[PDB]
Amino acid sequence: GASTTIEIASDGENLAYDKKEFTVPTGQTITVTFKNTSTAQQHNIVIVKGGEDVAAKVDEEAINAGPPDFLPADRTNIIAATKMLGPGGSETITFTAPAPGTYVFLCTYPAHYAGGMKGVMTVAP
Ligand SMILES: [Cu+]
């Protein structure tokens, strides 16, 4: 089920992605295209280096960091991230898949993570 090309989008106007999981192969170049399909909301996708603990810390850094991108100053805990996309915006990010394991992805727009806008990237060995 592992793929090197991933398409993901917001679930219309809801605080969710259209996928809560996807699998990628370790050590290979991954392409992820994220589409903000909402009418009036801002979304990104941020893939963190770890699980729910790392995601919570990033999410907190993000809200402190503020607009327009709501990302921490550096990517020490971030595998990859888009910019903060407007309604109808899309962005493709490229990264080398990290070590095999489970990696949380989330939207870091204020309240969106707590709102359920999250999932898991599984990296196959
Ligand atoms: Cu969002």
UniProtKB/TrEMBL annotation:
Cu(2+) binds at residues 43, 107, 112, 117. It comes from Roseiflexus castenholzii (strain DSM 13941 / HLO8). Cu(+) binds at residues 43, 107, 112. Residues 7-123 form the Blue (type 1) copper domain. GO terms for molecular function: copper ion binding; electron transfer activity. The chain holds residues 35 to 159 of 159 of the full protein. The keyword Electron transport applies. It comes from the Bacteria. This is Blue (Type 1) copper domain protein. Keywords: Copper, Electron transport, Metal-binding, Signal, Transport.
